[PDB]
């Protein structure tokens, strides 16, 4: 009974540390066959798209249009979904993703301002009814996420955005999470141990209810 779990949040939200907790939890619950995926990326094509999308001046001085941005995130996503994720799930292997469609809804929807209706029809046109079985949205303030991204190194094209861009993106993450009960909003502005605990119980409960 394979499942697709996705972790979401701004850069700097600590999604890898969150995945470590998710893995430990699942393992303690006897769930051990799983593979990881990260978006944008995960296949030769997705990795090339990832570079065009994030590398500073990937296309010189030309500015990538918001819609071209949206469509490349979707090209990378569907490539990954169809050639990696689905087959893994069809094989009984669980899949834990670092970002998925919610990222597009929050960043291109909230941060860029692309119409939600449009994003919805794109998602349906491209992915149909495929959705993650559980999503863990790690909520962190924009200032803390950015501080962490900068401490890490050079900022990608999107992370170089304004505070207002991240502010809008965060809000839309919450807004979308509020309308889907399978998307849990985890308070990640709390100390690490508190965060890790929230994740562990949420996951444990969801699995028990499986
Ligand atoms: C899929 C998609 C993405 N995007 C945007 C989202 C992004 O802005 C950008 C690049 O996306 P990317 O995720 O590949 O970029 P990454 O560099 O991988 O960023 P992540 O989103 O994976 O960051 P995380 O914060 O989860 O990663 P983690 O490795 O856990 O931590 C990042 C750094 O923060 C520190 N950190 C983490 N937690 C910390 C804590 N509690 N205290 C202190 N520091 C902490 C870590 O030490 C590390 O340096 O693309 C869209 O616009 N639309 C889409 O559809």
CSV table of C-alpha atoms and ligand atoms in Angstrom, one decimal:
chain,number,residue,atom,x,y,z
A,1,UNK,CA,0.0,0.0,0.0
A,2,UNK,CA,2.6,2.6,-1.2
A,3,UNK,CA,2.2,6.3,-0.5
A,4,UNK,CA,3.6,9.5,-1.8
A,5,UNK,CA,4.6,11.9,0.9
A,6,UNK,CA,5.7,15.4,0.1
A,7,UNK,CA,7.4,18.0,2.3
A,8,UNK,CA,7.0,21.7,1.5
A,9,UNK,CA,8.1,25.1,2.8
A,10,UNK,CA,10.2,28.1,1.9
A,11,UNK,CA,14.0,27.6,1.3
A,12,UNK,CA,15.5,27.6,4.8
A,13,UNK,CA,12.5,25.7,6.3
A,14,UNK,CA,14.6,22.7,6.9
A,15,UNK,CA,12.9,20.1,4.8
A,16,UNK,CA,15.8,17.6,4.8
A,17,UNK,CA,16.0,17.5,8.5
A,18,UNK,CA,12.2,17.0,8.4
A,19,UNK,CA,12.6,14.1,6.0
A,20,UNK,CA,15.1,12.5,8.3
A,21,UNK,CA,12.4,12.5,11.1
A,22,UNK,CA,9.8,11.2,8.5
A,23,UNK,CA,12.1,8.4,7.6
A,24,UNK,CA,12.9,7.5,11.2
A,25,UNK,CA,9.2,7.5,12.0
A,26,UNK,CA,8.2,5.4,9.1
A,27,UNK,CA,11.0,2.9,9.8
A,28,UNK,CA,10.0,2.6,13.4
A,29,UNK,CA,6.5,1.8,12.0
A,30,UNK,CA,7.8,-0.9,9.8
A,31,UNK,CA,7.7,1.0,6.5
A,32,UNK,CA,11.2,0.7,4.9
A,33,UNK,CA,10.9,0.5,1.1
A,34,UNK,CA,11.0,4.1,-0.2
A,35,UNK,CA,12.8,6.4,-2.6
A,36,UNK,CA,13.4,10.1,-2.5
A,37,UNK,CA,12.7,12.8,-5.1
A,38,UNK,CA,13.4,16.5,-5.2
A,39,UNK,CA,11.8,19.1,-7.5
A,40,UNK,CA,12.8,20.7,-9.7
A,41,UNK,CA,15.0,17.8,-10.6
A,42,UNK,CA,15.3,14.0,-10.5
A,43,UNK,CA,15.8,13.0,-14.1
A,44,UNK,CA,18.2,14.2,-16.8
A,45,UNK,CA,15.6,16.4,-18.3
A,46,UNK,CA,14.3,17.8,-15.0
A,47,UNK,CA,17.9,18.6,-14.0
A,48,UNK,CA,18.4,20.6,-17.2
A,49,UNK,CA,15.2,22.4,-16.5
A,50,UNK,CA,16.2,22.9,-12.9
A,51,UNK,CA,19.3,24.7,-14.1
A,52,UNK,CA,17.5,27.0,-16.5
A,53,UNK,CA,15.0,27.8,-13.7
A,54,UNK,CA,17.4,28.5,-10.9
A,55,UNK,CA,20.9,29.4,-12.2
A,56,UNK,CA,21.6,33.1,-12.1
A,57,UNK,CA,21.6,34.4,-15.7
A,58,UNK,CA,21.0,30.9,-17.0
A,59,UNK,CA,19.8,32.6,-20.2
A,60,UNK,CA,22.0,35.7,-19.9
A,61,UNK,CA,20.3,39.0,-19.5
A,62,UNK,CA,16.9,37.8,-20.8
A,63,UNK,CA,14.3,37.6,-18.0
A,64,UNK,CA,12.3,34.3,-17.8
A,65,UNK,CA,8.6,35.2,-18.0
A,66,UNK,CA,6.4,34.1,-15.1
A,67,UNK,CA,4.4,31.8,-17.4
A,68,UNK,CA,7.6,30.2,-19.0
A,69,UNK,CA,8.7,29.7,-15.4
A,70,UNK,CA,5.5,27.9,-14.5
A,71,UNK,CA,5.6,25.7,-17.6
A,72,UNK,CA,9.2,24.6,-17.0
A,73,UNK,CA,8.4,23.6,-13.4
A,74,UNK,CA,5.5,21.6,-14.9
A,75,UNK,CA,7.6,20.0,-17.6
A,76,UNK,CA,10.2,18.9,-14.9
A,77,UNK,CA,7.3,17.7,-12.6
A,78,UNK,CA,5.5,15.6,-15.2
A,79,UNK,CA,8.8,14.1,-16.4
A,80,UNK,CA,9.6,13.1,-12.9
A,81,UNK,CA,6.0,11.9,-12.0
A,82,UNK,CA,5.6,9.8,-15.1
A,83,UNK,CA,9.0,8.2,-15.3
A,84,UNK,CA,10.1,8.0,-11.6
A,85,UNK,CA,7.3,8.5,-9.0
A,86,UNK,CA,4.4,6.6,-10.5
A,87,UNK,CA,6.5,3.5,-11.4
A,88,UNK,CA,7.9,3.5,-7.9
A,89,UNK,CA,4.5,3.7,-6.4
A,90,UNK,CA,3.2,1.0,-8.8
A,91,UNK,CA,6.0,-1.1,-7.5
A,92,UNK,CA,5.1,-0.8,-3.9
A,93,UNK,CA,7.9,1.5,-3.0
A,94,UNK,CA,6.9,4.6,-1.0
A,95,UNK,CA,8.1,7.9,-2.4
A,96,UNK,CA,9.1,10.9,-0.2
A,97,UNK,CA,9.3,14.1,-2.2
A,98,UNK,CA,11.1,17.4,-1.4
A,99,UNK,CA,8.6,19.7,-3.0
A,100,UNK,CA,5.9,19.0,-5.6
A,101,UNK,CA,2.9,20.9,-7.0
A,102,UNK,CA,2.1,22.9,-3.9
A,103,UNK,CA,5.4,24.7,-4.5
A,104,UNK,CA,4.1,25.9,-7.9
A,105,UNK,CA,0.8,27.0,-6.4
A,106,UNK,CA,2.6,28.9,-3.6
A,107,UNK,CA,5.5,30.4,-5.5
A,108,UNK,CA,4.0,31.0,-9.0
A,109,UNK,CA,0.5,31.5,-7.5
A,110,UNK,CA,1.4,33.5,-4.4
A,111,UNK,CA,4.8,35.0,-5.2
A,112,UNK,CA,4.5,35.6,-8.9
A,113,UNK,CA,0.7,36.3,-8.9
A,114,UNK,CA,-0.4,33.8,-11.5
A,115,UNK,CA,-4.1,33.2,-11.3
A,116,UNK,CA,-5.1,30.3,-9.1
A,117,UNK,CA,-7.7,29.2,-11.6
A,118,UNK,CA,-5.1,29.0,-14.3
A,119,UNK,CA,-2.7,27.1,-12.0
A,120,UNK,CA,-5.5,24.6,-11.2
A,121,UNK,CA,-6.4,23.9,-14.8
A,122,UNK,CA,-2.7,23.4,-15.6
A,123,UNK,CA,-2.3,21.0,-12.7
A,124,UNK,CA,-5.3,19.0,-13.9
A,125,UNK,CA,-4.3,19.1,-17.6
A,126,UNK,CA,-0.7,18.0,-16.7
A,127,UNK,CA,-1.1,15.6,-13.7
A,128,UNK,CA,-4.8,14.8,-13.8
A,129,UNK,CA,-5.9,13.6,-10.4
A,130,UNK,CA,-2.5,12.4,-9.2
A,131,UNK,CA,-1.8,13.9,-5.8
A,132,UNK,CA,0.5,13.2,-2.8
A,133,UNK,CA,-1.2,11.2,-0.1
A,134,UNK,CA,0.3,13.3,2.6
A,135,UNK,CA,1.9,16.7,2.5
A,136,UNK,CA,3.9,18.3,5.3
A,137,UNK,CA,4.1,22.0,4.9
A,138,UNK,CA,6.8,23.4,7.2
A,139,UNK,CA,5.9,27.0,8.1
A,140,UNK,CA,8.8,29.3,8.7
A,141,UNK,CA,9.0,33.1,8.5
A,142,UNK,CA,10.4,34.6,5.3
A,143,UNK,CA,13.3,36.4,7.2
A,144,UNK,CA,14.4,33.2,8.9
A,145,UNK,CA,14.2,31.2,5.7
A,146,UNK,CA,16.3,33.8,3.8
A,147,UNK,CA,18.8,34.1,6.6
A,148,UNK,CA,19.4,30.4,6.4
A,149,UNK,CA,19.6,30.3,2.6
A,150,UNK,CA,22.2,33.1,2.6
A,151,UNK,CA,24.2,31.4,5.4
A,152,UNK,CA,24.3,28.3,3.1
A,153,UNK,CA,25.8,30.0,0.0
A,154,UNK,CA,24.8,31.8,-3.2
A,155,UNK,CA,21.1,32.4,-3.7
A,156,UNK,CA,19.4,30.8,-6.8
A,157,UNK,CA,17.3,33.1,-9.1
A,158,UNK,CA,14.1,32.7,-7.1
A,159,UNK,CA,15.7,33.0,-3.6
A,160,UNK,CA,17.0,36.4,-4.7
A,161,UNK,CA,13.4,37.7,-4.6
A,162,UNK,CA,12.0,40.4,-2.3
A,163,UNK,CA,10.6,39.9,1.2
A,164,UNK,CA,7.2,40.6,-0.2
A,165,UNK,CA,7.6,37.8,-2.7
A,166,UNK,CA,8.4,35.3,0.1
A,167,UNK,CA,5.7,36.8,2.3
A,168,UNK,CA,3.1,36.3,-0.4
A,169,UNK,CA,4.4,32.8,-1.1
A,170,UNK,CA,4.2,31.8,2.6
A,171,UNK,CA,0.6,33.1,2.9
A,172,UNK,CA,-0.5,31.1,-0.1
A,173,UNK,CA,1.1,28.0,1.3
A,174,UNK,CA,-1.0,28.4,4.4
A,175,UNK,CA,-4.1,29.3,2.4
A,176,UNK,CA,-3.9,26.2,0.3
A,177,UNK,CA,-3.1,24.0,3.2
A,178,UNK,CA,-6.2,25.3,5.0
A,179,UNK,CA,-8.4,23.9,2.2
A,180,UNK,CA,-6.9,20.4,2.1
A,181,UNK,CA,-7.0,18.1,5.1
A,182,UNK,CA,-4.1,15.9,3.7
A,183,UNK,CA,-1.8,18.9,3.7
A,184,UNK,CA,-0.7,19.5,7.3
A,185,UNK,CA,0.6,22.9,8.5
A,186,UNK,CA,3.6,22.3,10.7
A,187,UNK,CA,4.8,25.2,12.9
A,188,UNK,CA,8.5,25.2,12.0
A,189,UNK,CA,9.3,28.5,13.8
A,190,UNK,CA,9.5,26.5,17.0
A,191,UNK,CA,12.8,25.0,18.3
A,192,UNK,CA,14.0,21.9,16.4
A,193,UNK,CA,13.0,19.3,18.9
A,194,UNK,CA,9.4,20.7,19.0
A,195,UNK,CA,9.3,20.7,15.2
A,196,UNK,CA,10.6,17.1,15.0
A,197,UNK,CA,8.0,16.0,17.5
A,198,UNK,CA,5.1,17.6,15.6
A,199,UNK,CA,6.2,15.8,12.4
A,200,UNK,CA,6.6,12.5,14.2
A,201,UNK,CA,3.1,12.6,15.7
A,202,UNK,CA,1.4,13.8,12.5
A,203,UNK,CA,3.1,11.1,10.5
A,204,UNK,CA,2.5,8.4,13.1
A,205,UNK,CA,-1.2,9.3,13.3
A,206,UNK,CA,-1.7,9.5,9.6
A,207,UNK,CA,-0.1,6.0,9.3
A,208,UNK,CA,-2.2,4.6,12.2
A,209,UNK,CA,-5.3,5.9,10.4
A,210,UNK,CA,-4.1,4.2,7.2
B,1,LIG,C1,9.3,22.9,-7.3
B,1,LIG,C2,9.3,24.4,-7.3
B,1,LIG,C3,10.2,25.2,-6.7
B,1,LIG,N1,10.1,26.5,-6.7
B,1,LIG,C4,11.2,27.3,-6.2
B,1,LIG,C5,11.4,27.0,-4.7
B,1,LIG,C6,12.8,27.5,-4.4
B,1,LIG,O1,12.8,28.9,-4.1
B,1,LIG,C7,13.4,27.2,-5.8
B,1,LIG,C8,14.6,26.2,-5.7
B,1,LIG,O2,14.1,25.1,-5.2
B,1,LIG,P1,15.1,24.0,-4.4
B,1,LIG,O3,14.4,23.4,-3.3
B,1,LIG,O4,15.8,23.1,-5.3
B,1,LIG,O5,16.2,24.7,-3.7
B,1,LIG,P2,17.1,24.2,-2.4
B,1,LIG,O6,18.4,25.0,-2.4
B,1,LIG,O7,17.2,22.8,-2.4
B,1,LIG,O8,16.1,24.6,-1.2
B,1,LIG,P3,15.1,23.8,-0.3
B,1,LIG,O9,13.8,24.3,-0.6
B,1,LIG,O10,15.4,22.4,-0.5
B,1,LIG,O11,15.6,24.1,1.2
B,1,LIG,P4,15.5,23.5,2.8
B,1,LIG,O12,15.5,24.6,3.7
B,1,LIG,O13,14.4,22.4,2.8
B,1,LIG,O14,16.8,22.6,2.9
B,1,LIG,P5,17.7,22.0,4.1
B,1,LIG,O15,18.8,21.4,3.4
B,1,LIG,O16,16.9,21.2,5.1
B,1,LIG,O17,18.2,23.4,4.8
B,1,LIG,C9,18.7,24.5,4.0
B,1,LIG,C10,19.7,25.3,4.7
B,1,LIG,O18,19.1,25.9,5.8
B,1,LIG,C11,19.7,25.4,7.1
B,1,LIG,N2,18.7,25.1,8.1
B,1,LIG,C12,17.7,24.3,8.1
B,1,LIG,N3,17.0,24.2,9.2
B,1,LIG,C13,17.6,25.1,10.0
B,1,LIG,C14,17.4,25.4,11.4
B,1,LIG,N4,16.5,24.9,12.2
B,1,LIG,N5,18.4,26.2,12.0
B,1,LIG,C15,19.4,26.7,11.3
B,1,LIG,N6,19.6,26.5,10.0
B,1,LIG,C16,18.7,25.6,9.4
B,1,LIG,C17,20.5,24.2,6.7
B,1,LIG,O19,21.6,24.1,7.7
B,1,LIG,C18,20.9,24.4,5.3
B,1,LIG,O20,22.1,25.3,5.2
B,1,LIG,O21,12.4,26.8,-6.7
B,1,LIG,C19,9.1,27.2,-7.4
B,1,LIG,O22,9.1,28.4,-7.6
B,1,LIG,N7,8.1,26.4,-7.9
B,1,LIG,C20,8.1,25.0,-8.0
B,1,LIG,O23,7.2,24.4,-8.4
